[PDB]
Amino acid sequence: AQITGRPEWIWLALGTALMGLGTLYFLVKGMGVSDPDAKKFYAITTLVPAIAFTMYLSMLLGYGLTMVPFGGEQNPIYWARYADWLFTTPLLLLDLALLVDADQGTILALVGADGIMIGTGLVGALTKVYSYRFVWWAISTAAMLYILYVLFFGFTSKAESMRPEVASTFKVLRNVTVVLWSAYPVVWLIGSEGAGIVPLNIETLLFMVLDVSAKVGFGLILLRSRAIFGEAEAPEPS
Amino acid sequence: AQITGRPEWIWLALGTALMGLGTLYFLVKGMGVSDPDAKKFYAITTLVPAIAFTMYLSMLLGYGLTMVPFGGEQNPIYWARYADWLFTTPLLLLDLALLVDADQGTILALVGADGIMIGTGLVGALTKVYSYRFVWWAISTAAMLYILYVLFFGFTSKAESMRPEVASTFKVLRNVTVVLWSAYPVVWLIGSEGAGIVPLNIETLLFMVLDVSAKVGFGLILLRSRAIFGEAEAPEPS
Amino acid sequence: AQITGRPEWIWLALGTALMGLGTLYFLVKGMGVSDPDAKKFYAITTLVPAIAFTMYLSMLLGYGLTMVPFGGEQNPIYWARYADWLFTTPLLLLDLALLVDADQGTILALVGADGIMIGTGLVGALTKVYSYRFVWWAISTAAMLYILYVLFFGFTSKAESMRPEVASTFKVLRNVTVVLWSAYPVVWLIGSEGAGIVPLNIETLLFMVLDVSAKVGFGLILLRSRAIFGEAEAPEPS
Ligand SMILES: *C/C=C(C)/C=C/C=C(C)/C=C/C1=C(C)CCCC1(C)C
Ligand SMILES: *C/C=C(C)/C=C/C=C(C)/C=C/C1=C(C)CCCC1(C)C
Ligand SMILES: *C/C=C(C)/C=C/C=C(C)/C=C/C1=C(C)CCCC1(C)C
Ligand SMILES: CCCCCCCCCCCCC
Ligand SMILES: CCCCCCCCCCCCC
Ligand SMILES: CCCCCCCCCCCCC
Ligand SMILES: CCCCCCCCCCCCC
Ligand SMILES: CCCCCCCCCCCCC
Ligand SMILES: CCCCCCCCCCCCC
Ligand SMILES: CCCCCCCCCCCCC
Ligand SMILES: CCCCCCCCCCCCC
Ligand SMILES: CCCCCCCCCCCCC
Ligand SMILES: CCCCCCCCCCC
Ligand SMILES: CCCCCCCCCCC
Ligand SMILES: CCCCCCCCCCC
Ligand SMILES: CCCCCCCCCCC
Ligand SMILES: CCCCCCCCCCC
Ligand SMILES: CCCCCCCCCCC
Ligand SMILES: CCCCCCCCCCC
Ligand SMILES: CCCCCCCCCCC
Ligand SMILES: CCCCCCCCCCC
Ligand SMILES: CCCCCCCCCCC
Ligand SMILES: CCCCCCCCCCC
Ligand SMILES: CCCCCCCCCCC
Ligand SMILES: CCCCCCCC
Ligand SMILES: CCCCCCCC
Ligand SMILES: CCCCCCCC
Ligand SMILES: CCCCCCCC
Ligand SMILES: CCCCCCCC
Ligand SMILES: CCCCCCCC
Ligand SMILES: CCCCCCCC
Ligand SMILES: CCCCCCCC
Ligand SMILES: CCCCCCCC
Ligand SMILES: CCCCCCCC
Ligand SMILES: CCCCCCCC
Ligand SMILES: CCCCCCCC
Ligand SMILES: CCCCCCCC
Ligand SMILES: CCCCCCCC
Ligand SMILES: CCCCCCCC
Ligand SMILES: CCCCCCCC
Ligand SMILES: CCCCCCCC
Ligand SMILES: CCCCCCCC
Ligand SMILES: CCCCCCCC
Ligand SMILES: CCCCCCCC
Ligand SMILES: CCCCCCCC
Ligand SMILES: CCCCCCCC
Ligand SMILES: CCCCCCCC
Ligand SMILES: CCCCCCCC
Ligand SMILES: CCCCCCCC
Ligand SMILES: CCCCCC
Ligand SMILES: CCCCCC
Ligand SMILES: CCCCCC
Ligand SMILES: CCCCCC
Ligand SMILES: CCCCCC
Ligand SMILES: CCCCCC
Ligand SMILES: CCCCCC
Ligand SMILES: CCCCCC
Ligand SMILES: CCCCCC
Ligand SMILES: CCCCCC
Ligand SMILES: CCCCCC
Ligand SMILES: CCCCCC
Ligand SMILES: CCCCCC
Ligand SMILES: CCCCCC
Ligand SMILES: CCCCCC
Ligand SMILES: CCCCCC
Ligand SMILES: CCCCCC
Ligand SMILES: CCCCCC
Ligand SMILES: CCCCCC
Ligand SMILES: CCCCCC
Ligand SMILES: CCCCCC
């Protein structure tokens, strides 16, 4: 943690803090919720920042950091991010899928595709041959594009099915997802794990901003809506 | 396995044996059970000691043992225990949750909180900076306390819901869980992975006694009850 | 990847290719399927070769290869296969279980037993003490035999239950499974990870042929049948 990771500590520290407080806020928010469906959205959404909190701390303390030889050098790689995403990204997808009461088959596809995206991202992050790192990047990107596709096609129906009553929240949470998520591959490609055009320091800041928005930001919007209570034809505001 | 792990072999061996026989006994016990719900409790409960059997053997053979530098020394750490618990603790929680027909949202919360408890416990077990090991211990402990809380609040209802007919078993299995589980953090804190007040030898014995009671002990009580067959208003003793 | 793995590259390359094309074919095949149940079989079955594709490539590029000291030598071990199987074997079992609408309890048992089979296989593959490698092999084999057993007993009922209408597909997919799966333990035992009677080169070819048949082969048969649409009393050919 001397020359490996240090300048970026500030972002890691802020990251940890913002994720901790977010978890505590959603935790308090969920107290009292007796609604079955509401219970699902709270559990899922609370765990997301909780898990990230854990991994951000591992990176801050230096545990979730490792050196990867490539390009003829020792490159500081935060593998901890993948352990985080492995569980948080599928969970966020569960939030969107549950809103529209997606089919099991669609959930499985979304989850599997995400595991591939993260798993291949991790392999690319640890791959010793530079050129091959981008081969893994391309496959993970295809996995992501598959996911984005599913979220926009064959995932809704207003004819009393998936988006018949209150689907406005889903549309907004979908907008954020596609926008934020699509930024990760770019950051990775230009940062320390990729071309190295942006220093690890700036890379960390970007991932911190993206993570907090995709977890806490995403969470705030979802847990404030009325869509988490009713889908048939009952809002349930209070 | 020379100076790293040796004196504790006896407990590891006994551990392995008691877990093996327990798995074989539950295995035989489940033969014939056609009851759907009963089938769930048998599958879950049989797998628990089966998994532990595997990990206890890995520790006995030396595979699930690693050296962790901290406190200015090479500390023998049985990481295998975490691989065990990662799967067995959520499974035990599934047994309790299924008994009371808990909500999905509650199951998710219980499972997620457990994964955090185990994951953070593992990170603390492998952390190179001594003082930081206890930071991970505190977080894992909070996760555990969260779980214990859930098991005692907003997890029952006699008004024909969660604990309307036969909930006596749940109460007894809950008593054992809170008592045994709460002992793990103490053992860890005073043993080899923590302060080092108790030798690894005695630590292993304690974890062996606790594990067998929380798995086989817990299993015997559950698989003998009638609660595994009926919940509505039918015991189904024979 | 110099003396460790090289001669076997051809099989790894072919493996990668056959798995890629298989995934792409099932992908195209699933386009349009609106049937809920059909959706499950397509998702599961498509992901299988997709995951294997990823791991076959990791082995081809050298990432999923490691050296394991035993027998007084450095033995080239493709650990990547276990990461593949960890997810693909349970998924294939889900296909068979879903066809007959197996009970939850039975699915859990099948899944748990498979995780043990793969996990113990992995430990045996990485174990440093030669003789102990076969102890792990025996346990994994018992796990496999348990699975085969379940697939042939207490897994069907023509009296309007599990195999009342179209169970012919299940019988054929069961025949292939038991035959192909039973070959893996033999190959492992006689190959590089075991006795070393068959060179790693030939071992790889065998696993490649077995994998493609158990994934793509198995997939083609399943995704062409009408059983994936109806079970009650409706084929749904077109
Ligand atoms: C809380 C974190 C979230 C929502 C993270 C999402 C991450 C991604 C969409 C990352 C995807 C990647 C690729 C498509 C290519 C390879 C590198 C990754 C892992 C950055
Ligand atoms: C079969 C094993 C069982 C039921 C094990 C349960 C384990 C725990 C409740 C362990 C919890 C821990 C903490 C709360 C703090 C950090 C260390 C641990 C992992 C021992
Ligand atoms: C796509 C791959 C498939 C269907 C692979 C299946 C693998 C097995 C049935 C492997 C089982 C093994 C044992 C029973 C003993 C130890 C070694 C293994 C892992 C080869
Ligand atoms: C910043 C808080 C750290 C959390 C430690 C334990 C968390 C358990 C979270 C469970 C969340 C869903 C119910
Ligand atoms: C709303 C009922 C839930 C039925 C099970 C859904 C499984 C979702 C998989 C999520 C992946 C977890 C990391
Ligand atoms: C790099 C830009 C930082 C943006 C921070 C935005 C915080 C949003 C607070 C919510 C305000 C609602 C009206
Ligand atoms: C001590 C017995 C070792 C077990 C080896 C294989 C176990 C498979 C267990 C499946 C349990 C739930 C059905
Ligand atoms: C009784 C029906 C079961 C519905 C799914 C429950 C999922 C439980 C998660 C258990 C965690 C496994 C390690
Ligand atoms: C350290 C104390 C050992 C306790 C062993 C107890 C075994 C319990 C057997 C059940 C007896 C039922 C009457
Ligand atoms: C819907 C189930 C499959 C999801 C697959 C995502 C795959 C991304 C890369 C695949 C490589 C193709 C050979
Ligand atoms: C057809 C409804 C599905 C209910 C959940 C089944 C869980 C199957 C576990 C599969 C293991 C995944 C690797
Ligand atoms: C080692 C033998 C190779 C076998 C290849 C068989 C491919 C099967 C193609 C399907 C033909 C259907 C009539
Ligand atoms: C300086 C540490 C602060 C910890 C927060 C305690 C309050 C938790 C409740 C959140 C509303
Ligand atoms: C040496 C390269 C091996 C082939 C890799 C397949 C890559 C597919 C990328 C996504 C279109
Ligand atoms: C309708 C929900 C809005 C999501 C994006 C919010 C960005 C808020 C920033 C305030 C300047
Ligand atoms: C999604 C729009 C694409 C913008 C261009 C990104 C390129 C980044 C690399 C800088 C050389
Ligand atoms: C000395 C090894 C004993 C193995 C046990 C075989 C019997 C299994 C059936 C359990 C009632
Ligand atoms: C240097 C310490 C970093 C802050 C850690 C947060 C710990 C929370 C413990 C549970 C109350
Ligand atoms: C009502 C179930 C009892 C659980 C604790 C049992 C301990 C038994 C020990 C016998 C001396
Ligand atoms: C749950 C009751 C607490 C008893 C005290 C445990 C302290 C153990 C440490 C010994 C110095
Ligand atoms: C030489 C690479 C070929 C890639 C395949 C592109 C077509 C995909 C659609 C499959 C029918
Ligand atoms: C030194 C050997 C330890 C005992 C292992 C139990 C093996 C069971 C194999 C399956 C019948
Ligand atoms: C009834 C399905 C057949 C499964 C085995 C097929 C083998 C085909 C090989 C063609 C020579
Ligand atoms: C399933 C039939 C068994 C055939 C014999 C396999 C033995 C392989 C080892 C070669 C010495
Ligand atoms: C000198 C104190 C370091 C910062 C502590 C802040 C906790 C978020
Ligand atoms: C150390 C700062 C604590 C953050 C509290 C949350 C502000 C809304
Ligand atoms: C159900 C998803 C399986 C996870 C596969 C891992 C991808 C490399
Ligand atoms: C209709 C979608 C436009 C193209 C989106 C992304 C390209 C990879
Ligand atoms: C909700 C409409 C999406 C438009 C996205 C623009 C793509 C660059
Ligand atoms: C409503 C416009 C959608 C914009 C989506 C952004 C494309 C990257
Ligand atoms: C490296 C990224 C390729 C471009 C993808 C789509 C641009 C919006
Ligand atoms: C050189 C500074 C990079 C700017 C990052 C902006 C954070 C929102
Ligand atoms: C000398 C024999 C060692 C002990 C074997 C016992 C198996 C539980
Ligand atoms: C080696 C001892 C075998 C244990 C058998 C179980 C006793 C009830
Ligand atoms: C460090 C915790 C791992 C998260 C597992 C996710 C539980 C569904
Ligand atoms: C009502 C609960 C009493 C306190 C229990 C545990 C303290 C951490
Ligand atoms: C069933 C009542 C629980 C009392 C536990 C005592 C706490 C130290
Ligand atoms: C019925 C009394 C409950 C005791 C619980 C034990 C507290 C650690
Ligand atoms: C190290 C443990 C702190 C005390 C927890 C509750 C005592 C029953
Ligand atoms: C010095 C012996 C420790 C006692 C452990 C007791 C096992 C129940
Ligand atoms: C010289 C070209 C190597 C083989 C490429 C084939 C892709 C399947
Ligand atoms: C490089 C060969 C491509 C394979 C296409 C699939 C043949 C049916
Ligand atoms: C060594 C076996 C791992 C256990 C996985 C649990 C299956 C639900
Ligand atoms: C009725 C089954 C015959 C024996 C099968 C496998 C032996 C391990
Ligand atoms: C479908 C009948 C199975 C016979 C298998 C032969 C075993 C060697
Ligand atoms: C219909 C005959 C079944 C053959 C099964 C093969 C046994 C290994
Ligand atoms: C090494 C394998 C033992 C024999 C198993 C059953 C033969 C069909
Ligand atoms: C020496 C060649 C081994 C034969 C392997 C056959 C592939 C089906
Ligand atoms: C030396 C490799 C043997 C493989 C022969 C042909 C495989 C079909
Ligand atoms: C990022 C801080 C989370 C709390 C928002 C109210
Ligand atoms: C502790 C604050 C409670 C928040 C209620 C909405
Ligand atoms: C579960 C932690 C995995 C670490 C990845 C390098
Ligand atoms: C669970 C471990 C995640 C890290 C991957 C190397
Ligand atoms: C690696 C992630 C596993 C996905 C489980 C649904
Ligand atoms: C690099 C892939 C970007 C995808 C755009 C949505
Ligand atoms: C220094 C400001 C940090 C906030 C990140 C968006
Ligand atoms: C610990 C031994 C398990 C069997 C109890 C009958
Ligand atoms: C092999 C013993 C059978 C047990 C029946 C209860
Ligand atoms: C799956 C085995 C993980 C080992 C942890 C150090
Ligand atoms: C599955 C691996 C568990 C060990 C963690 C280091
Ligand atoms: C690491 C444990 C995963 C939890 C799956 C429900
Ligand atoms: C160290 C935590 C103990 C919890 C008591 C139930
Ligand atoms: C020597 C006795 C071991 C039993 C553990 C409770
Ligand atoms: C092995 C090739 C897969 C495609 C079969 C049509
Ligand atoms: C691209 C080919 C389409 C296949 C339709 C069955
Ligand atoms: C998730 C990858 C694990 C690698 C096993 C050695
Ligand atoms: C997820 C990691 C699989 C490799 C086991 C060592
Ligand atoms: C290691 C495989 C986990 C099984 C999840 C159902
Ligand atoms: C080595 C085990 C073979 C099993 C035969 C079906
Ligand atoms: C060289 C032929 C390869 C096909 C494997 C069955």
Q: What is the C-alpha separation between B86 and B114, in angstroms, rounded?
A: 8
CB nearest A42 (choices: B105, B127, B129)? B105
Rounded Cα gap, residues C162 and C72, in angstroms: 52
Cα B146 to middle of ligand 18, angstroms: 16
**CA atoms A99, A102, A104, A109: torsion sign:** negative
From the list C177, C205, C178, the residue with the least C-alpha distance to C191 is C205
Q: Identify the three-state secondary structure at position C67.
A: strand
Distance of alpha carbon A53 from alpha carbon A49, whole angstroms: 6
Listing DSSP states for A56-68 in one string gives: HHHHHTTTT-EEE
Residues in chain C: 238
Q: Which sign, positive or negative, has the C-alpha torsion B143, B145, B147, B153?
A: negative
For residue C39, give the nearest of A106, A123, A129 by CB distance. Answer: A106
Q: How far apart are the first and last CA of chain C?
A: 49
Dist CA A133 CA C58 (whole Å): 11
Chains that contact C by 3+ CB pairs under 8 Å?
Answer: A, B
Q: Where are the alpha helices (DSSP H) in chain A?
A: 9-30, 36-60, 80-99, 104-126, 130-152, 168-181, 183-190, 200-212, 218-224
Q: How far apart are CA A190 and CA A186, in angstroms?
A: 6
Q: Where do the H-state alpha helices sit in C157-196?
A: 168-181, 183-190
* Unique residue bearing structure tokens 């934020």: A180
Beta-carbon separation of A63 and B115 below 8 A: no
Closest partner CB to B103 (pick from A36, A51, A57)? A36
CB C177 within 8 A of CB C151: yes
Is A39 in Cβ contact with B104 (below 8 Å)? yes
B88, amino acid identity: T
Q: Whole-angstrom Cα distance, residue B95 to residue B177?
A: 11
- Are A43 and B109 in contact (CB < 8 Å)? yes
Closest Cα to residue C79, out of C123, C117, C116? C123
Q: Are the C-beta atoms of residues A11 and A208 closer than 8 Å to each other?
A: yes
Please give the Cα distance from B147 to B117 (Å, whole number): 9
Question: Cα–chain-centroid distance for residue A234?
Answer: 30
Torsion sign (Cα): A46, A51, A52, A53: positive
Sign of torsion over alpha carbons C184, C65, C58, C110: positive
The CA-to-CA distance between both ends of chain B, in Å, stands at 49
Cβ(A179) – ligand 30 distance below 6 Å: yes
- Among all residues of chain C, which has the CA nearest to that of A127? C63
User: What token pair was written down for C194?
Assistant: 């075991």
DSSP letter at B217 equals I
What does this entry list as its resolution, in Å?
2.2
The whole-angstrom separation of Cα A41 and Cα A227 is 10
Contacts with A214 (C-beta within 8 Å, 6 or more apart), sequence order: A92, A176, A177, A180, A181
Residue of chain C minimizing CA distance to B47 = C112
For ligand 5, mutation pick of A45, A86, A94 (most atoms within 8 Å of CB): A94
How many angstroms separate the CA atoms of B104 and B112, rounded? 12
Assign B67 to helix, strand or coil. Answer: strand
Q: Whose CA is nearest to atom 1 of ligand 23?
A: C172
Residue with tokens 């053997």: B57
What are phi and psi for residue A69, nearest 5 degrees? -75, 120
- Residue A20: closest C-alpha in chain B: B139
Is the CB of C54 less than 8 angstroms away from the CB of A139?
A: yes
State the smallest CA–CA distance between residue B86 and chain C in angstroms. 13
Euclidean distance between CA atoms A34 and A18, whole angstroms: 27
> CA-CA distances (angstroms) from residue B159 to B165, B168, B230, B232, C81?
9, 15, 16, 11, 51
- Neighbour tally for C196: CB within 10 Å: 14
Give the whole-angstrom CA distance, residue C153 versus residue B155: 37
Which are the contacts of C223, defined by CB distance < 8 A and separation ≥ 6?
A: C26, C29, C41, C42, C45
Which strand (E) or helix (H) includes residue B154? none
Please provide the size of chain B in residues.
238
Q: Residue A213: CB partners within 8 Å, gap ≥ 6? A: A176, A180
Residues B147 and B178 sit within 8 Å (Cβ to Cβ): no
| φ/ψ of residue A75, rounded to 5 | -95, 120
Q: Which CATH superfamily is domain A1-238 in?
A: Rhodopsin 7-helix transmembrane proteins (1.20.1070.10)
To test the pocket of ligand 57, the residue of B11, B16, B18, B45 to mutate (highest count of ligand atoms within 8 Å of its CB) is B18
Angle, alpha carbons C81-C82-C86 (nearest 5°) = 125
- Name which residue sits closest to atom 1 of ligand 53, judged by CA: A83
**What is the bridge-based pairing of β-strands C66-69 and B66-69?**
unpaired
What are the backbone dihedrals phi and psi of residue A180, each rounded to the nearest 5 degrees, phi first?
A: -65, -50
* Residue B234 CB coordination number (10 Å): 11
Strand, coil or helix: what is A154?
coil
Which amino acid residue places its CA nearest to atom 1 of ligand 11? C98
Residue B28 Cβ inside 6 Å of ligand 38? The answer reads: no
Q: Are C60 and C17 in contact (CB under 8 A)?
A: no
C214 DSSP 8-state letter: I
Q: Is the Cβ–Cβ distance between A221 and A172 less than 8 Å?
A: yes
Does ligand 7 have an atom closer than 6 angstroms to the CB of C146?
yes
The backbone torsions φ and ψ at residue A154, rounded to the nearest 5 degrees and listed phi first, read 50, 45
CA B16 from centroid of its chain's CA atoms: 15
In chain B, whose CA is at the least distance from the CA of A80?
B123
- CA distances from residue B173 to B96, B181, B206, B210 in whole angstroms, order as listed: 7, 12, 20, 14
For residue A82, CA distances in Å to A21, A39, A116, A198 come to 22, 27, 11, 20
Closest residue to B119, CB basis, from A43, A46, A54: A54
Ligand 67 site, residue C10, Cβ cutoff 6 A: no
What is d(CA B117, CA B141) in angstroms, rounded to the nearest whole number? 7
- Chain centre distance of CA A189: 17
Taking an 8 Å cut-off on Cβ atoms, the answer to whether A105 and C47 are in contact is no
* Distance from the B186 Cα atom to the nearest Cα atom in chain C, whole angstroms: 30
CB–CB contact C120 B54 (8 Å): yes
Give the span between the Cα atoms of B139 and B126, in whole angstroms.
15
Residue C66 sits at φ, ψ, to 5 deg, of: -145, 155
β-strand partners of A76: A67
Residues of chain B contacting residue C106, judged by C-beta atoms under 8 Å apart: 39, 43
Q: Which of B105, B120, B126 sits opposite A43 (nearest CB)?
A: B105
The CA angle B136-B123-A2, to the nearest 5 degrees, is 90
Provide the shortest C-alpha distance from residue B124 to chain A (in Å): 10
Question: Torsions phi, psi of C158, nearest 5?
Answer: -80, -15
Q: Which H or E run contains C142?
A: helix C130-152
The C-alpha atoms of residue A100 and residue A106 are separated, in whole angstroms, by 11
- CB contacts of B50 in chain C (<8 Å) are 112, 116
CB A31 within 8 A of CB A68: no
Whether B189 contacts B141, CB under 8 Å: no
Residues on chain C touching A127 (C-beta within 8 angstroms): 61, 63
Burial class of residue A42 (count of CB atoms within 10 Å of its CB; 0-12, 13-18, 19+) = buried
Which experimental approach was used here? X-ray
Q: Quick one: C24 exposed, middle or buried, by C-beta within 10 A (0-12, 13-18, 19+)? A: middle
Q: Which of B237, B188, B176, B238 is nearest to B212 (CA)?
A: B176
Among B123, B173, B116, which residue's Cα sits nearest to residue B143? B116
In the structure encoding, which two tokens stand for residue B68, read together?
A: 């962790």
Name the token pair of A85: 């995403």
Number of cross-chain residue pairs from A and C with Cβ atoms under 8 Å apart: 51
Query: What dihedral angle (degrees, nearest 10) is formed by the CA atoms of B111, A211, A216, B152?
Result: 20
